[PDB]
């Protein structure tokens, strides 16, 4: 009953954040304070659209 639409492998390409978990945790508070706006925009998109394919950008 329908084809599942999937993004191409190119659309899933991104510059990865390749730091370890302890590095992320050390900077977690400052990172949450500084990059708050894009993070909250993505989280609102994610919880409103209920679809990962609609919030890749």
């Amino acid at each position: 009953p329908g084809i599942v639409e999937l993004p191409t492998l190119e659309d899933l390409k991104v510059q990865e954040v390749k730091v370890s978990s302890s590095v992320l945790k050390a900077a977690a508070h400052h990172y949450g304070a500084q990059c708050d706006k894009p993070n909250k925009e993505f989280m609102l998109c994610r919880w409103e659209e209920k679809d990962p394919r609609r919030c890749l950008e």
Binding site: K25, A28, H29, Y31, G32, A33, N39, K40, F42, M43
Partner: protein, 71 residues
């Protein structure tokens, strides 16, 4: 003309020998023991109260770190 020599008690007698039961008291009162126990309990309660409140704050900080990293 040797006199008689035999196993005999010393002149006078032997020293007294104790035989009655000797079980001293050697203890505190019940009130004192209960007071020390309750005092120890109260001190422990106070210390654990402070430590657990600090632990709650530390857990909140850890959860905030996770929340900041989640997106």
């Amino acid at each position: 003309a040797s006199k008689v020599k035999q196993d005999m008690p010393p002149p006078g007698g032997y020293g007294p020998i104790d035989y009655k039961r000797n079980l001293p008291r050697r203890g505190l009162s019940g009130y004192s023991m209960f007071a020390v126990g309750i005092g120890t309990l109260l001190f422990g309660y106070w210390s654990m109260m402070k430590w657990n409140r600090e632990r709650r704050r530390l857990q909140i900080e850890d959860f905030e770190a996770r929340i900041a990293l989640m997106p």
